Amino acid sequence: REIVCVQAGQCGNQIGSKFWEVISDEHGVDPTGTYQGDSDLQLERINVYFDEATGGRYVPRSVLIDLEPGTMDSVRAGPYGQIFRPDNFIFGQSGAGNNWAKGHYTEGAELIDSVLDVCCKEAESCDCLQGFQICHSLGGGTGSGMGTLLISKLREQYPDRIMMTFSIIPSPKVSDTVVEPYNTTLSVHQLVENSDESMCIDNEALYDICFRTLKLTTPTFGDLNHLVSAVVSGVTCCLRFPGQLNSDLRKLAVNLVPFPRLHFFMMGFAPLTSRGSQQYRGLSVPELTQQMFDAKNMMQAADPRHGRYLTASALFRGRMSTKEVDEQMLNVQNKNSSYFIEWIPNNIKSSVCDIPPKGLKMAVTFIGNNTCIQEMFRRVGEQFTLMFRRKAFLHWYTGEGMDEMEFTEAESNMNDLVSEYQQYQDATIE
Amino acid sequence: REAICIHIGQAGCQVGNACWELFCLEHGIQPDGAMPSDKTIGVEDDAFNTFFSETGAGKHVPRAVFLDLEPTVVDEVRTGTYRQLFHPEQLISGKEDAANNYARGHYTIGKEIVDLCLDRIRKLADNCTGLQGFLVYHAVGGGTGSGLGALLLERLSVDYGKKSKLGYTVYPSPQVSTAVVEPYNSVLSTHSLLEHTDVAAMLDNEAIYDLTRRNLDIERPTYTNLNRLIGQVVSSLTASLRFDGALNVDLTEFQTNLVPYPRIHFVLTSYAPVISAEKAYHEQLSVSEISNAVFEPASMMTKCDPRHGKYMACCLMYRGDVVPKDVNAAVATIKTKRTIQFVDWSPTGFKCGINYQPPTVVPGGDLAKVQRAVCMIANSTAIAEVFARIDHKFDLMYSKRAFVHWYVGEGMEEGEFSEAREDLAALEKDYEEVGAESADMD
Amino acid sequence: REAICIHIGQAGCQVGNACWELFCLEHGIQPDGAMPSDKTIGVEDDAFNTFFSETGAGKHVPRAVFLDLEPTVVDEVRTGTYRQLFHPEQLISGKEDAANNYARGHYTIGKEIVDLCLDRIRKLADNCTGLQGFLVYHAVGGGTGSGLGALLLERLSVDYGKKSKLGYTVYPSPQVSTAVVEPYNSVLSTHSLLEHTDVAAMLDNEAIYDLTRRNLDIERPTYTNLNRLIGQVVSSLTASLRFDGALNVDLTEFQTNLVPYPRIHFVLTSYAPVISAEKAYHEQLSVSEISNAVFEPASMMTKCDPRHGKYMACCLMYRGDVVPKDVNAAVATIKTKRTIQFVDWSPTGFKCGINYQPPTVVPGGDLAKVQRAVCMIANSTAIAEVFARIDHKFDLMYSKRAFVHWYVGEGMEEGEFSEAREDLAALEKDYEEVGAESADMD
Amino acid sequence: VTPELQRTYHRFGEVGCTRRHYGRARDPPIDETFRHGIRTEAGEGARGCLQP
Amino acid sequence: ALERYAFKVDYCDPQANLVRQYLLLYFAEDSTIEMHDLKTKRVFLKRCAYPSLTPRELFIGATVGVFSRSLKLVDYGDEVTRRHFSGSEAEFVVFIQEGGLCHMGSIIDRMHTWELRITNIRLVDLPDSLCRDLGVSRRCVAILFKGSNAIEKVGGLSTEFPNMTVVVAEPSDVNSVRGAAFGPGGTTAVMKNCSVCVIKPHAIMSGYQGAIIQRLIDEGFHITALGMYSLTVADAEDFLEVYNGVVPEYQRLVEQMSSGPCWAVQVCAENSVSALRAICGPHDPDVCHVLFPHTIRSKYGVDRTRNGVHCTDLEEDAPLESEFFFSLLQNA
Ligand SMILES: Nc1nc2c(ncn2[C@@H]2O[C@H](COP(=O)(O)OP(=O)(O)OP(=O)(O)O)[C@@H](O)[C@H]2O)c(=O)[nH]1
Ligand SMILES: Nc1nc2c(ncn2[C@@H]2O[C@H](COP(=O)(O)OP(=O)(O)OP(=O)(O)O)[C@@H](O)[C@H]2O)c(=O)[nH]1
């Protein structure tokens, strides 16, 4: 049960490099590609993410795409970069220009066929294909346009598989680019139709994790991408190791999404704690559960206390009793009962896996479906409405060729997504 | 990757000498175009490629042309220290100057020389594989810089099309002046520059003199100091193309982020750690102090006060040892300030860039050595005040036809003055209209 | 943590030289701004931070500006021994003095210099993270000290708002005098200072001369002695910020404890073990004797007699080897005396502070070395007689407008004299009313 | 020929050169090789907290 | 010193069985490295910090480990480095006479502290002609070495160790002793009642070799043979046949022993194999750092693959290993 990864744009390629470092470490793969691990449990599911080349070496089932090769040359030049298959790097000759329309319509359609050819070559070689995994930012140019284009093409070609996305989205507190609202609105419009499950992360939340929880004096983008790579590698853990209560991406989707538009989730990872403090507090399921529901440990700016949970899932790694897990999830549901949607009798799914991440006795990753995500989209829509009334930078997009009607359509679809989330928050059983 | 530099007239060639001196010293090419015979490693690196191409013997030669109608300045380049760096065909010189007449440069004299310039630029553009714009240096106060610069920009814009054209322009200072006919030439230049340029950077000599008096300790500055500051600014802006960094910025990203409407393309430029060596040991120079510095009007290189207008967009380029979190904290502190105001239709007002290469130190230079620097280009409605004073001086002179007989004799209809003056009036009205607030009622 | 020092005019700069000499020697920074040469490890302790900031190379620089309209005193600082300590921007000098005219400082000349001062203070305040007040040194008898001190305090009070501002002020002595126009300048100063100062410390040169004659054995004192005494007092008050102690006292606690009503903020200062080296080795200097000393009128630094009034609050600072039981026993002994009287609405009349750092000895100095010292600041109604006598001197001169034409020529209306004189009359009435018994009503 | 001390005390210096204060000329000359500014303190990482 | 070093290195690829060449640059101002590919003219690795690499280890014929790859320095890639190493290429010989065998570990340690690189070493007995000509004893230790300012440095051995060292500087005598002392020939190793200890390449580059030999002398053992040999991959496999299927780090041991040259000593004492095993310590340095803190592997070992020294485990194989080191490798 093997996943194919696609990494698009600068943010996606950078997070991907750290992800493949973390995965190669957990399975004991040397940066030369030689297996150097120390338990049979590592080898027995290696097929899930790696293909085997002749001899010792293993090669990772990933496609790298970018519009200017600077980032790709940096990732190929990195310390683990050699493991990647040379034929899997696809690049153009001129940048996205931070413009969605350029990335989607002009150079996108020029490159996109070679990416589908590589993805099809990789998929049809698999004996049974599980979902795709894609990392990209929504605020950028090449990330937004080709990521959503490629997602649409893969959804046309593999409608029976799973579609999973990890996405970084612009915050108003610390923007790097002026035209972020347009690109974000068009990308959310594409995702809500095409995707099966989409995960969202705010850079502001990663900075607050680093400064308040980890007390790092000088965090860097490598740290933010390491936290994201930790959650990404954690969600898939039950695919590739034994456990007392197995779980699967499809089982996650069936238990989390009540209605097909409501597929946007929050992320957290629990055993975050500073090196000075670690001597003072042992790991246990109550402690993990307390950190797990603390809004301090969530990777989005919206806070759970302003909404209600429709559904949530917790995947535990480590040797632990099921009784303590079940009663902790029951006690949290009973004590905070106003924050859980009342017409569902049990909102939390649990899963238990025997093999923890290296150097931790136990870990849990938390996925939550909460209506407070509407505030984030609303904030982006406000900035769009401020910019759109004055045609502030629109001639670039119109010069690529877009009709203004796309912008009003994308706004209407995002506004309808916000309305759909808001109605279930404010409702009675009747 | 590649950019082509076009230097026109006296100010543009003299600023070019400082620019190419700096770019040589930053990459390490010796003045004869070679590299040290010892430092060679076997496999060289692409960073020069933005500005230099190498011959098969390994000599470097730069992607520039020097254009003048009088010989003297180009003969100074041919006989100077950098004789061997430039290709001799690239250094084009006429017989006689345009004598402060835009008409003489544009109609009579530049028409003979212009086809050589296009042939040289074509020969350069054929030896490229990723050209991404033209950089142009000229002054609009003189005859050949205005007239031939306009004619050449028109021809370049028809032949090359969509490629971007970024101009660095020295405008006539608001009370320091050097020639009587400056208003006429600047108006007629600006008429052509409106249609055929993608971004225009504004300079005033009086501001760079003031900056060199207050921050540096120079009582008697001269043009070499100003030209070294301009060269440093250009090196800072093009560094994003040439070295590794956290947040790169391609030249098309400047135009996408800075220009909201196709006429609103005139921008202000400033540079932060202009400081002397003796001051440098009394002060630390963290990110937040230089970020606060770039917004003070004492730092600006154009004589305008931005407190009389509203910012529309800012582009902040950081080079050296800077970390993104400090940029974010600084920009949030700037955003907090009450004397800094943005138009309400531009909520996300800033674009950032971060590059690892620290600023270079020039052997004869007057700047201190510093670990980090920031450079800003920003779009603001305050620029409307600069045009209004030139227009007032034009109106004063044109009421009596003070010099017009030269221009009509050298080939121009009197009507062309009124057309240009009406176009600049419309540009002033555009800057009045763009700055308004509407639909307050909801 | 941080405090910023502003020195205005001649007396304030001369007292500043002694203050910064003392603070350097007490912390151990060399006159060139460096640490002792015997250490080879990074810095470990924050106590310098209240007054100095370090550069990345480890030089120290002090949190002060020197403001003057005449060059001579600041040029003396520039050419003196502490040349390397100060940043050159901090030493600000005009061209010509305010010529003992408040009007010249406030209206004509200080108006040109004031914007530079605010820009420097802003540049200082931006490099802070817990600023807790301004310290200001000036004399109200001279023209630039009065006019620029008032204008600058007004601007600081609008721009910075709630931040505290504490002034140390040299007032015209009650019969010693140096210039004819002292009453006019002191009245006009006091009018502005009433609205725009949070605590005012009162000084008379005649008292410090008397103290140096009686206690020390100095027949012929000069300004360096007085300035060193003032520096010791300021060091004692700011020591609570800088060193470990049993009972610390933050600058906001002064304001909370000493000021009963918002106008009643003028305080007297005195210092106990002013003693010569020959007397110092024959005697111990215990707590109860020096506590008895600070209440004797021979110890005060202002020429007023506290027996003609009632105390409202006292703040007692002990520094050195003192134990709390001895401060409590001393205050209990003081409280029994009948010639010391407190207003009946202030039953808990005392605040105590205890700091471990003993007073520093300066190589050329005249104070002895002592293991302990106490410094007192107290609010008392006796100050009303000093103002009443200044107002009487004003009334004598002002009845015929003896010199007013200078002030009216330099830009001031004659009406402003009467306004200020009526405001100080109201301040006098405040001191009669606050001291009026109220328990008589049943 | 203008002597060195009097030239130190003139009002105007040479063209296009920075001038020192006259109370500073006797001191030893400054150093130009050194590069000023505070070094950023970059230490540790998130991997130690995530993977003890 | 330097601002930038430049060497070209070869890397033996086990999967491809080819030898690849790269270009390695070291920036000494901030301790970062960067690698390029000569065959492709492309970047292999950016400027990344690498604190385990120091300028002292950079010399020709050395071996370094960069991201689990063993790189062998081959030739200078720049003329700055060639000019800086203009000296340090002449080979001289220092002898240790009979009275100095008890102090030979201190001699080798002193040579290592003087920035001197040993290019060969052997314990031999010279023919009588060279014995008379040079002025040495019958049984002596011959050390061949190179380095910067070599002659002036080795003059200090005359006063630190009186009358036990002989220095040779003439090229003709060096050629004669190179032909005679080293090369194919006989050996002084015994064939019974012996044990073999092997110094791994990483300890050779780090240079704890003199301390190990002097510890062996101090404990009371006798050295009956000594030499340096370079092991091919097949030789390393045939040396560690008995460790296949028994220890989990067999392949890593193979590549470590084939990485570079190794020193092999022979020890003779009472119950030699057990005594040497006791003095070396357990196989894992983690056990040593807790329960056996005085052993050699505690000081000079970091994991199971690189525990510093190697000692015979089965008393049935001591003559086998002694033969494999001192006859098969030496003679042919
Ligand atoms: N900053 C700077 N300004 C210059 C320089 N040279 C000339 N200028 C200014 O530019 C204006 C004069 O323009 P010129 O370049 O001399 O005119 P021109 O291009 O030679 O035109 P012709 O006189 O017809 O040959 C004046 O305002 C000068 O102050 C220079 O080297 N640096
Ligand atoms: N303690 C002390 N008092 C001084 C000193 N110099 C002057 N004074 C006193 O301050 C008052 C005179 O104020 P000045 O400082 O001379 O006035 P100014 O600031 O120079 O104002 P202008 O005369 O307009 O320049 C008189 O009471 C002097 O006794 C000094 O060095 N130490």
Ligand SMILES: Nc1nc2c(ncn2[C@@H]2O[C@H](COP(=O)(O)OP(=O)(O)O)[C@@H](O)[C@H]2O)c(=O)[nH]1
């Ligand atoms: N978390 C994270 N964010 C990044 C990284 N690189 C860029 N970003 C953010 O992504 C946005 C820029 O988008 P970008 O990737 O350049 O868009 P593109 O030009 O289409 O590839 C900004 O908000 C950056 O702060 C990274 O490595 N990690």
Ligand SMILES: [Mg+2]
């Ligand atoms: Mg000219």
Ligand SMILES: [Mg+2]
């Ligand atoms: Mg004065």
